[PDB]
Amino acid sequence: RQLPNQMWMQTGRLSIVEAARHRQSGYLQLRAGKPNPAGGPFKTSIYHRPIVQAELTAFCVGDQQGIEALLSE
């Protein structure tokens, strides 16, 4: 680990304003009047997962030419 570990927050939110605009315009056929950030399509979820800058070292028995071909891909 070249750096100390950090944590990345990412969120999943469905655009509530765009959902209401599409629901009036008819492009979204949603019969539901009220959304729910708790659960459902409009669940604004938060999830935090670790992040590391590092150098990755692995050891294996294989032909170098194919391994360098795959790793250059």
Add this chain to the structure above:
RNA sequence: GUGAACGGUGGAGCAACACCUGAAGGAAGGCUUGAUGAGCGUGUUCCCCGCAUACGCGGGG
């Protein structure tokens, strides 16, 4: 088929209200635009310096 693959940090919110840079403080004390340079004496061959190279030229008092 990378414990992978998928995943918006988002929406809203006035740095604003009031506040004298001001009071006092001498540019003065002394100083001729007046002169200065404008006119007033010597009466004939005597030293010394260069170009020459003496046939003579310039020249110090």
